[PDB]
């Protein structure tokens with residue numbers, strides 16, 4: 173029989189909005205979920221969504237015959253610069269399906285062999301950076317992880333070197349993209365967007381879009397002119413056919429997309445992993461021992477990364493606790509009932525609150541808050557739709573294998589090359605942008621004097 177949908181405190185015509193008067197809205201919604209349970213309605217002026225937190229409801233939402241990816245308002249604003257790349261396209265846009273079909277084989281686990289040398293290139297740069305630090309100095313963790321992931325995606329995506337490890341101020345592309353991402357997210361909590369006070373924001377937003385497009389269009393053009401074949405996604409996209417290839421502007425949007433979709437999620441994952449590693453020294457030692465036992469050569473080979481099983485488990489456990497893209501939106505394809513209790517109208521939006529999902533005690537046990545890579549010892553033991561840091565179904569993360577291969581490589585290399593110290597007894601503080609990251613996370617890395 174039909175249930176009254178829980179909803180948190182309403183504030184007259186502001187609805188539930190004031191509850192998100194915070195720079196930590198995801199963490200705020202987690203607290204609401206902890207109070208209200210597996211499902212709640214959340215209203216703002218002109219907006220309604222329902223937050224799902226239980227594996228039970230989310231498995232059902234994960235039925236693609238019943239629910240399909242929705243573009244959240246975040247994605248709708250990101251779309252201004254990510255256009256109709258995969259991430260910000262409706263499933264029923266032909267460019268979604270076309271691009272999806274073309275790119276998927278180039279994002280497979282098999283394809284990761286072709287990117288490995290480039291990820292190694294940037295990973296070695298990270299290690300060398302840290303090798304070259306003076307004895308007193310520390311590492312700004314998410315800061316260097318983001319240098320690494322932006323560079324790695326730049327290099328594998330379109331053979332472009334941002335050379336973030338050569339700079340204080342990032343490449344102009346990266347400044348524009350990060351500033352564009354920031355504006356997209358600032359627009360979520362902007363009630364009066366037409367306030368002249370934002371004219372400069374709007375001018376800057378346009379400048380940043382032009383910077384991104386010009387760089388990527390130039391490089392696409394240079395490649396189409398040379399016909400050079402390389403190991404990058406760009407080569408795949410230029411060669412792909414559905415009969416017709418992606419047009420050059422969609423390819424630009426996919427390159428921009430891989431950067432937006434991948435850089436911070438992946439850098440956050442590395443940061444959260446290392447955080448959990450230093451806060452659990454017995455896990456760190458097990459991981460460090462595997463890295464030494466497995467990464468026997470100066471350069472990690474593709475095959476060796478695949479053998480870093482425990483590193484893989486540490487990464488999944490960090491993803492369980494702090495999925496760095498913590499929410500994704502769905503809509504009801506038809507009027508339906510969710511969970512046998514909650515009627516939904518065609519077009520009704522649902523948000524999957526991934527960190528809450530991942531703390532479903534009926535699935536994981538009472539110890540959900542504890543960092544235990546061992547949960548992942550046997551992945552077949554994890555129920556369907558219990559673990560969703562990479563989204564769902566045909567709209568799941570296309571970069572999942574790339575991200576995990578990257579993160580495993582890099583984590584492996586860090587563990588092989590350094591002993592790490594939580595010199596500040598760092599206190600977890602999760603900054604929310606469009607992704608999650610442990611802000612201010614700093615460590616000291618003491619080199620084991622192992623040559624590369």
Ligand code: HEM
Pocket residue numbers: 241258259260272325429430431433434435437438441495496497499500501561562563564566567568569570571572574575
């Ligand atoms: C730990 C790292 C990552 C996490 C946690 C993550 C998470 C996600 C999630 C949750 C989605 C689905 C969002 C939704 O339903 O609206 C998604 C989609 C996507 N991601 Fe990832 N991502 C990661 C790394 C990457 C990387 C490295 C790339 C590119 C190389 C990438 C490219 C994409 C693309 C193109 C989509 C859209 C897929 C589609 O709808 O066809 N991601 N990601």
